[PDB]
Amino acid sequence: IKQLDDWLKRDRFVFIGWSGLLLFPCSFLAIGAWFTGTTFVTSWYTHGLVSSYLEGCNFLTVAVSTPAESMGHSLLLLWGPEASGDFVRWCQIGGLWTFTALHGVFGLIGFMLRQIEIARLVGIRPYNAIAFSAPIAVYCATFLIYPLGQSSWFFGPGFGVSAIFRFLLFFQGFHNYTLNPFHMMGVTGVLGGALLCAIHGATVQNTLFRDNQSKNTFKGFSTDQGEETYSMVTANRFWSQIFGIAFSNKRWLHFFMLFVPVTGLWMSAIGMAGLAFNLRAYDFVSQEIRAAEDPEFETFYTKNILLNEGLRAWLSEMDQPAKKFVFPDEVLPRGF
Amino acid sequence: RYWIIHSITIPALFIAGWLFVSTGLAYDAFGTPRPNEYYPS
Amino acid sequence: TWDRFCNWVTSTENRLYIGWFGVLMLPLLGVSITVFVTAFIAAPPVDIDGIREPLSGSLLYGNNIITAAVVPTSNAIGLHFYPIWEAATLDEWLYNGGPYQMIAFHYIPALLCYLGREWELSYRLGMRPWICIAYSAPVAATISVFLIYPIGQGSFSDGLPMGISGTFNFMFVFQAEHNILMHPFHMLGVAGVLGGSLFCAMHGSLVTSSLVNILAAHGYFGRLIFQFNNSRQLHFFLAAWPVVCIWFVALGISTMAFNLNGFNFNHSVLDSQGRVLPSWADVVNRASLGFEVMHERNAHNFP
Amino acid sequence: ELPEAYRAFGPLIDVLPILPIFFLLLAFVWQASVGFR
Amino acid sequence: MVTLKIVVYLTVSFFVGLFIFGFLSGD
Amino acid sequence: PGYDEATSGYAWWAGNARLITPELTGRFLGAHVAHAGLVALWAGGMLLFEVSHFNLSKPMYEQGCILMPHIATLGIGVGQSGEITSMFPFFAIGVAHLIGSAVLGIGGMYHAIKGPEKLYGFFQFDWTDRAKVAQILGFHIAILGIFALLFAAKAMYWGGLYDPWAPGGGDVRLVTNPTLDPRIIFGYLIKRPTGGEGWIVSVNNLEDIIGGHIWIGCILIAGGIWHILVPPLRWTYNLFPWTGETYLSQSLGNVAGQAFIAAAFIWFNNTAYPSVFYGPTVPESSQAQSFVFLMRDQGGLGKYLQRSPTGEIIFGGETMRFWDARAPWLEPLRGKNGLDLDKLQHDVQPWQLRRAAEYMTHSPIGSLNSVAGLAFNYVSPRTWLASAHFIFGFFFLVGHLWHAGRARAAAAGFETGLDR
Amino acid sequence: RVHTSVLNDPGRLIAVHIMHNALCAGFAGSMLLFELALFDPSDPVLNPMWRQGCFLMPFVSRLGVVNSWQGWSVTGETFTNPGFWTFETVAIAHIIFSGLSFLAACWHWVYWDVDLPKVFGIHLTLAGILCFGFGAFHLTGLFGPGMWVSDPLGLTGHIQGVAPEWGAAGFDPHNPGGVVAHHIALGIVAIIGGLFHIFVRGNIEGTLASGLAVFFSGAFIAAGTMWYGTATTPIELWGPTRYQWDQGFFQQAISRQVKASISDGKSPSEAWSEIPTKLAFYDYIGNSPAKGGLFRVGRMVDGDGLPTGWLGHPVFKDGEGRELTVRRMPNFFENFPVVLFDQDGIVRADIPFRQAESKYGIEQTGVTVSFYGGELDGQTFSDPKDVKKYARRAQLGEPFEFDRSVYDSDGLFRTSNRGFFAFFHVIFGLLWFFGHIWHGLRALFQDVFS
Amino acid sequence: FTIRWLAIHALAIPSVFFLGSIAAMQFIQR
Ligand code: CLA
Ligand SMILES: CC1=C(/C=C/C(C)=C/C=C/C(C)=C/C=C/C=C(C)/C=C/C=C(C)/C=C/C2=C(C)CCCC2(C)C)C(C)(C)CCC1
Ligand SMILES: [Ca+2]
Ligand SMILES: [Cl-]
Ligand SMILES: [Fe+2]
């Protein structure tokens, strides 16, 4: 009871801790399932698609694809009634997706618990765990909350490069997710987060203190110090004169580097949670009616609506094989 | 001592991976269709 | 007295540094801000496609700020230099998307002067000079979409529209033409902004959580992963990763201007008979086809 | 289709373009074997 | 707008020459 | 001595920056001679590679050839309409670059390993020595001015160049009357870089190309003589630090700009880069699509002809962005107001219909999501060369920005950091 | 931050908690009065409460209060005496409590100058006594009204007591008896656990944090049971779910009702006239809660409008006289190509996009439409403008006439109260996950945060 | 016999088995 706690809490090459009993098997299983699915397992019976290296796919097109639409929101447990212990049936119905998705959440939970456990042991504030709540919010919203709100696990994101690319394009045509204001705040968070990474790193590097005489500064007896490696005063003077404003306090700037991408991801998680209920934003019916009453009238908004229509019709026969949509060539949209 | 059981069992696991696919056992174990089995003719 | 002007312009004592790049910047910014704001509010519709079907981009012609854009120069102009004086009339200039070419041709040099101004102040402040290197990544990115991609495609109508919905329209049309998702340089660009955000949140969280001490900040991070520790190397990597990746994605847009497109794995997996077995790339290709057919105004390879 | 007498040189030609990208690697292999001093 | 072309041609000449003669001085 | 981080100040990943010091000028030479061998090694190797895999049925641009078009454009082993006569001239050129790479390679290794650490005498140069570096600039300016005239003499006398604008297709022809007139030659520099104008990329005849190279070769010779005889004047003292890394950055900025001009040149020009060798330009392949569509239907009168904003008969639709494109197969049907309706009725020779039909399959006014190609995708050599050289032009401008700032910072003494 | 004033004082946190109880009940009584003012009680068939943006009203009627003191009930009827407990006296009782809680919070804020091996154990028996008593007396109907139960078609919902379902049938979410048995069983378990923690037994931020964990997990569960539909969210109160549209659950139920009745003795005009308008209204995609938008605010009736009546079932026939079926709109599609299929599955007609060639256009296929039941019973339409008009309407399920002027409706689908509840409580769950993390970390790190 | 042996041999034993199969798929005729 405290015997195993000492062995968990020890000084080795990788820390385990109590959180490691959740993180390490679940992450290994989630990653192991993804490798298993992308190497050997087909998506022919769930999507009519070929999706492993055994099929002839490459890294860009392998996926652990979502379960078949017939499976609904079943957990698709290996011993559950859908597979009944048959591993061949289980892989064919998409049981590896639910395996990867559900083991992914528990590793992600186990990871953030590990952040808390180490911060508690070392004795520092657990802001890294707070910041990791945003990748967890994005994952839960996109991989769990969205398919659960939808008709089946089928409409979730597949665990693959191109499956994700399909997921991106599906959200344009069917959800107009670019116009979603929460996705907009997400993009601002991520580009702003990337901007902060580049400016701050360049600002530190280019306001470094001269300590040694080597022409490479990655060893000027100041890297061990930490931040005090660079001139806060000269950096503030540069940015107050180039940009107008500068982050004068090192604590606030690093608070802002925390806050900007984390809040952005949390915003995108709210937008995604809304789309679980098909709650898409921004009708702008004035432009739609005007372009339905005046052929001379066109905006970029009404052009995008036509693009999304083209997306929906041209994708969904292939993208939803269980529905067995038949769109004759004449019903398909075009600008021809 | 160390490098004896690695010269034996590292190509042994690579061969077993190779024989998993080359003998077609990977298709049966996962239900992956063979190239002539996607479209039942 | 000329030296007095030289002394004030290069002075590091003003509220904002002007410098020599900045005397070649505030005119260019003066024009490009003024024309953008006026065109965003009040420009008449622009016949972007050149086939007399005008596109309304401005606030006073039916748009809100989300849907409004300065509409790119007409396809009829192509890459022609279209200054305000070479139009027949003022209305013909506005009809053929004159303001966009005015904005883009002042905004792009102004950013290049902002680049040199950032160098110039860092030189006068005794700083190392490479913050401007970092800023060259969004500059190259915006030049690729506003300048290089129109040049490669042969028309400024293919440039990025100066608006929120026009930008989205540009994304989808580009995907249809070029399959930017399967372009590895765009793949790098995504890793650059998502990872750049990751490193930003991580560095922000790690530093702020050790305020009261890097010895407990590296006892933390050394324990969370396997056991830098060099603040110089870490901060170089924080700059380098978003910057290098954004350079590649800017080069991706630029090389796709020449139609060096993303990977095409359409019809790339075949069965024993030679039937195409669809993959996820073929599903993406069908989706991007849906964008392509609406944007096309006559296709010549589709019933 | 190349000149008839020089058909034998053949695969050596097929290596000849990528011989410069091996000198870039040997700059790192030489740097490896001096300890990156 | 034949006078405006002159206005622009002079304005570009003046500001660019400023930049050219600014770096011609040397600092 | 200066061969490790301790005594140089530069780490291994910046290890070439240890050749900046004048103590190691001999190794500076051997780096450059060995590198020029590497440039020549690829040039010989890639050409022989391209010759080895070459098949005589597909023209030149359907085989991934970028070096063989360059040799063909000099007229080396090509006949009428750019058909290859003998592949042996291409082989002779490729082998010669191998031998030149061996001489340059051997001398590059000699100076980098066996030769003296620093040169002495006439070949001893110090970066801060304004007169000596400018003297070497003078020697090098003269040499490229020599070779510009050698190229023009080859075009005028020794075999000439392939002219795509020669009647009836194209043909190698001596450029017997080069344009020496300076207002034509230097009027290209004031032409705007925009559409319809195309600053120097719009050079569309071999007389202007060869006339320009005579002007370049001579001006470079007078410039070279100027730098050998005249050391740098006092107005060029405080413009920039007179150090080695300054000169590198100034080269980097100029060579970055050169790659951009070359990328535009391969993308738009079909005179210095004939379309029988490099493929059609995207502007010209869109004209080819519309032209054969006229000759299909009939066989602005029609749905394919509209007015330009300047009021000329052009091809209609998407390709009206490409109305400034000029091609040697299209130009015989061009009257005084753009396309001529009477010449698109009965003037069209079989070769123009032959030529335009090949250039059909090269035009991106179709579909990308099924395939945009001939067979499959088909990336053109013009796309490859323009993409590669834009990438070089960008990175070298970044390298310019890097080196120029560092040159400024190191002379002023704050390249290592700030003072506490 | 600002509210950390009351950490060093228990009695002023009782005051702050009573104040919150005043605001909650005050809202609940005044929100329910706002809903009563806007409510139209005339058509429970065609303007039920889930079309009218009633948030609180279904939760009141779930538990047995279905009458207004004006006389009307949300079920179907118009009692002379509606009893004491109505929507008005539920609202009044919450407002009276709120003012009384206002008075008690003021007294606790001023007079606070008045133990947790005991308090949580006290709180757990009380909640257990409440939970057992809710299940065993209210929900059973023994000493209470019962709860709302209905048939799975949602045609005959009413208030009745429910016997506890004590087996594995009780864990079926659509079994009302399980919810009764859950509350009796967990109520006993909480009383036993509570008296355990009274007799057999540090940071208050940790207690807040663990409470937030229960709140967000429950919020997702509440959002999930709302969105998926259980016995506790009847479709007469919260409307159909998106899943009932997905599997054509009401379409199959109607066609079962018609094929049975045709097989007994009746004609198709007689069979389809026997379909209740309530039943046909459920089989219409504008009643699916997955058709709305983020900023399409208000009631479903602010969208498509007030339904006037069912038009009847449209039956489509081509020139061959073979039966055609419009492919119904999925939830995913804002607009959907109008394609008509025969019984085998072949496209026979469509409404084409341009209309460039149709080969399959309505004009050239000669498609007619006939209606059975409803308003247009016995009518046949043969003109293409009529048939194309009804083919678009048929793609949304059973066609209804809408009056768009009663509520000045804008034609844009709203989500129901079910969709609005599920969305907000997912947002509430996501937010309260963050608050749980924030307060969990602050409680676990109270020595490095202070 | 604790974590160090089990961590390396749970992540390299399948990783060379998988790399053995992925190497074998390259020589698949279809
Ligand atoms: C003629 C052009 C040229 C020349 C002569 C130099 C010369 C120099 N540069 Mg440089 N630079 C250039 C162009 C040039 N640069 C361009 C275009 C850029 C923009 C990217 C840069 C960016 C740059 C930086 C950031 C730095 C230098 C530095 C230096 C100095 C030391 C570099 C060194 O030792 O080699 C080292 C070589 C290596 C470590 C290997 C290069 C690794 C690259 C990234 C991979 C190349 C990718 C390649 C296309 C793909 C390979 C195929 C694959 C199979 C391997 C040196 C004097 C350093 C300096 O300032 O010292 C004072 C330094 O910090 N340069
Ligand atoms: C005193 C008294 C009395 C009286 C009482 C009364 C009369 C009352 C009331 C009350 C009321 C009448 C109340 C209320 C309430 C409300 C609330 C509590 C609300 C709210 C809100 C909210 C919370 C919201 C918010 C928001 C908005 C605004 C929107 C959305 C978003 C947000 C969230 C921001 C009596 C005699 C009886 C008794 C004794 C004394
Ligand atoms: Ca296209
Ligand atoms: Cl569009
Ligand atoms: Fe930092």
Residue numbers in the entry:
A (entry chain D): 15 to 350
B (entry chain E): 18 to 58
C (entry chain A): 14 to 225, 248 to 262, 266 to 341
D (entry chain K): 9 to 45
E (entry chain I): 1 to 27
F (entry chain C): 28 to 326, 339 to 413, 419 to 464
G (entry chain B): 7 to 120, 134 to 220, 232 to 480
H (entry chain F): 15 to 44
Paper lines:
Specifically, the PSII subunits D1 (PsbA), D2 (PsbD), CP47 (PsbB), CP43 (PsbC), and the 10 kDa phosphoprotein (PsbH) are replaced with FRL-specific paralogs; in addition, one Chl d and approximately four Chl f molecules replace five of the 35 Chl a molecules that are found exclusively in white light (WL) PSII. Light absorption by antenna pigments, including chlorophyll (Chl) molecules, initiates excitation energy transfer that ultimately results in charge separation in the reaction center core.
PCC 7335 (hereafter, Synechococcus 7335) cells that were acclimated to FRL. The following protein subunits fit the ESP map: PsbA3, PsbB2, PsbC2, PsbD3, PsbE, PsbF2, PsbI, PsbK, and an unknown intrinsic subunit with a single transmembrane α-helix. The apo-FRL-PSII structure presented here clearly shows that Psb28 is not required to achieve the configuration in which PsbD3-Glu241 ligates the NH-Fe, at least in this organism under these conditions (see the Experimental procedures section).
